[PDB]
Write a protein that binds this DNA or RNA. Structure first.
Ligand code: AMP
Ligand code: AMP
Lengths: 458, 458
RNA sequence: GCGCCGCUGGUGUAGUGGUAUCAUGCAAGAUUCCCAUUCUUGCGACCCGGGUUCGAUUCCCGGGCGGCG
RNA sequence: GCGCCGCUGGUGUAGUGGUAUCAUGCAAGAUUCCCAUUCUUGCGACCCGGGUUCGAUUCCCGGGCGGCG
């Protein structure tokens, strides 16, 4: 786990990721994600989407990566430059950049987003996408690259109605908070309950509180260990950072920054286009002339949690990376079964032909159930292929053995990657089992309780 | 349907997509996809992934969008330029471009891809991602833009073993083929069966045949009508194009081009790095000196189906776009229930408070079942809100009515967007129903057969 | 690209050297209890920059964007 | 960025002005019938360009990339 060299090796060898254009020499700070890396990235993203977007009914959008210079001048990003400069169309009349963040488009599409939500508040938009920084010296691999996938969430809330109705769901949750006070006081982080936290005013409100809870739950869900995960409040526009402890030290992997008055303002000035919600009045005010007002203009506070996926990924790598006891050439990852690149591996004992039927029958069966599987029927022994599949963090292994070919209820075995423990179950309900473990409704323990274990080949 | 102005209007108004940076004046050929557009895009992509990637067990990868000039010189793309030019890092020693296609990275990562598949053939890689063209005059909206999402598939096959074992699944399929012969002969396309097609040699092989079948099935699955969908063979490196008929005419939406000798070669020359598979020999040849050879080097043929998602999207728009009979202000889309941005809309009759419970209870219930839903509890009448939800192509509508508040088995109604037909079913199994219709296991007809219809409010 | 006009609430429009008509839409209220009901009330716009003018959204010049070869 | 070395099959390495050692890995065969078994056989490499040389992967110069401030 602590050994970054072994890990880096296992990552490179099995093509989790790799230096970009390595046949042309490679280019620093640019990385390509192979089959397993891509699969893990995708799984992580799907989980994120159905964690925040579905649960909060967030308006997600696709925006363009190119950006006209005036847009990035209004936001003060422009101000030898760390952005990627190009030109648009025919000639150099219209210079643009590659977006440094996927936040801007949301703001620039605010009016239509607000209309879509019927003009009502609060409302959340979000953008999952690639952003680009012309860093000078990228090191640490994924930690500092020049192009990367981030998932951003914009929460637009009435400055006067900033109080979240789903907060008692995250109320009893215990986190490591690293407040600015504790930082200037030469102290360390503290394990507080969330509600206690907001009461004592360490966390401004229950919206930031709720977000912090959910963000926690997500980051732990994908495989980050709580003990090495904290929330450091920014110190001298109130920002909180979800940070993880790695071999490189404490790195920022999520940025929760909540800034009221704005760039929404900025753009509204530069373009002279009001970007403002409106709230009807319970009691219409009359104000020269008699002039009753029935609505008030509202520029909404904005909470912005932005997730850096390269770093969430890497953190998962370091925390999950384990080495077996005995054969230390055998390494594996401990990916949670909901993000594992492959939930299942389909393996026969030896190259014996009578195994070919059941292998295919179930491989076509797992697909029908939508399970990501890797069927390994190559030359080497069962132990070797296990080492291979464990190495890429395959969650479970289905072994077809001689007792599969000679039994009335045809049974195969199911091996837990982590524990090296096995059970034996009929081949007809194996896809059901695997599928459900991959969708987190049950863990390995309950499978171990529901089915008879593997004691030996009869 | 034929009316592009009405459609364009409904697209703009409900924010399916919109001109990029419109508050800054907008920029031609760049478009941002709102909530519904993004949802449809995502659904389409998920369906694509579980259509090709899962079923063929394709090695999917994430590659970088930036690209060093030598890479694109080897591929002869460079040769006032239609690509987006920038520089990498500190200064202008290292100029690069924005990838015009997501194909290159796959080739550049070929060796590790081939190793991952144990060196065996055949094997498929694929890349879903954005590509960039500095077009001069973009028109037709999505048809010709400057940045767009394409999904590419690389199939690597032994030139001598080009014969697909899953072809009898697409054998009895009937398509419109537009062969080059028919084109130079002043004829039109022909509705051939696929197997007949390959026998008479109009389609070179059963791999191109199989791909063509699957591509067909996919494009029809997402909502493209067969009658306005054909496969035109390229005429004077054998290429086939999946084309659709729109108001703009026949446009190319998928490119199936199958070119043996290569850019794999090109890169292998420029970099001096052999990109070649190897095949063991059944009978080891002995060839001066006695020198037995046991493997032959094989440069594999490559089949490349590339999908243009902007165009597949637009095609879906034009084909699905319908206008009601009577109130022609009422327009709707006929999105297949597997790609519909929202499968369900949750609607009460009137603003009456006693409806608030059941609405929430099921909205939290649909989420638990993972169903994308839009709960509309706004001021206007049921007809207005229907018009709204139909307008964005919501697949089904759940109506909470007075008979929901006063019945022992609490029942609500389910309305079919297309037909305007309704049924009535208990609120406890509604998420099940909706969920399954959204996962294509049953159609509306079987629901209409399984449940009692809506005849009137008791 | 090059060309002939054009750009007014979210959408569709009338109008003029003295800051804007009507319809739809969206909210709130009341009606209404199945398919944009009705009434009331409220919300929102002259694509940018420069020039000419006492004053331009209107006239002229140049961005940008759109329709079409 | 600037700096001190460095780059040899997929990975880890020995070696030298005359084109490369060993281990692992991956295939095929045979053993083996639960956790990288064993034997046999096969597959694969000197990061690029220039210079000096009869000849460089080795020496020098400059790309690129990596480790580290
Ligand atoms: N050079 C970079 N490489 C990887 N991630 C980055 C980089 N810069 C910013 N991020 C991500 O940005 C998030 C914080 O937002 P910000 O620091 O404002 O960009 C973190 O989650 C990071 O993962
Ligand atoms: N300017 C463009 N806009 C949208 N799609 C494009 C464009 N150029 C190529 N494509 C897509 O590329 C595919 C065919 O490949 P190719 O024409 O070689 O790029 C089609 O499916 C198109 O959708």
């Amino acid at each position: 786990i602590v050994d970054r060299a072994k890990m880096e090796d296992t990552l490179k060898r099995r093509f989790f990721y790799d230096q970009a254009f390595a046949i042309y020499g490679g280019v620093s700070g640019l990385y390509d994600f192979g089959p397993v890396g891509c699969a893990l990235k995708n799984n992580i993203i799907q989980t994120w989407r159905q964690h925040f977007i579905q649960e909060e009914q967030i308006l997600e959008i696709d925006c363009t990566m190119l950006t006209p210079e005036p847009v990035l001048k209004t936001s003060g990003h422009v101000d030898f430059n760390l952005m990627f400069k190009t030109f648009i169309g025919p000639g150099g009349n219209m210079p643009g950049y590659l977006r440094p963040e996927t936040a801007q488009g949301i703001f620039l599409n605010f009016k239509r987003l607000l209309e879509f939500n019927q003009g009502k508040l609060p409302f959340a938009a979000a953008q999952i996408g690639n952003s680009f920084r012309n860093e000078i010296s990228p090191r640490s691999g994924l930690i500092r690259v020049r192009e990367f996938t981030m998932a951003e969430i914009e929460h637009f809330v009435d400055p006067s109605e900033k109080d979240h109705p789903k907060f008692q769901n995250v109320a009893d949750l215990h986190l490591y908070l690293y407040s600015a006070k504790a930082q200037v006081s030469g102290q360390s982080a503290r394990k507080m309950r969330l509600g206690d936290a907001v009461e004592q005013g360490v966390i401004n409100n229950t919206v930031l509180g709720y977000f912090i809870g959910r963000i926690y739950l997500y980051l732990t869900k994908v495989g980050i260990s709580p003990d090495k995960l904290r929330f450091r409040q920014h110190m001298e526009c109130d920002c909180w950072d979800a940070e993880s402890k790695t071999s490189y030290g404490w790195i920022e992997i999520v940025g929760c920054a909540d800034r009221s008055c704005y760039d929404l303002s900025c753009h509204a000035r530069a373009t002279k286009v009001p970007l403002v919600a409106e709230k009807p009045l319970k009691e219409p005010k009359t104000v020269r002339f008699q002039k009753t007002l029935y609505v008030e203009e509202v520029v909404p506070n904005v909470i912005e949690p932005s997730f850096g996926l390269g770093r969430i990924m890497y953190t998962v790598f370091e925390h999950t990376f384990h080495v077996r006891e005995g054969d230390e050439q055998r390494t594996f990852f401990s990916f949670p079964a909901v993000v594992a690149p492959f939930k299942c591996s389909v393996l026969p004992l030896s190259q014996n032909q009578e195994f070919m039927p059941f292998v295919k029958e179930l491989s076509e069966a797992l697909t029908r159930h939508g399970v990501s599987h890797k069927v390994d029927d190559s030359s080497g022994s069962i132990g070797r292929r296990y080492a291979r599949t464990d190495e890429i963090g395959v969650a479970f292994g289905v072994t077809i053995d001689f007792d599969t070919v000679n039994k009335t209820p045809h049974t195969a075995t199911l091996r837990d990657r982590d524990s090296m423990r096995q059970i034996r179950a009929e081949i007809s309900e194996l896809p059901s089992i695997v599928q459900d473990l991959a969708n987190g409704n049950i863990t390995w323990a309950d499978v171990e309780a529901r089915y008879p274990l593997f004691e030996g080949q009869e």
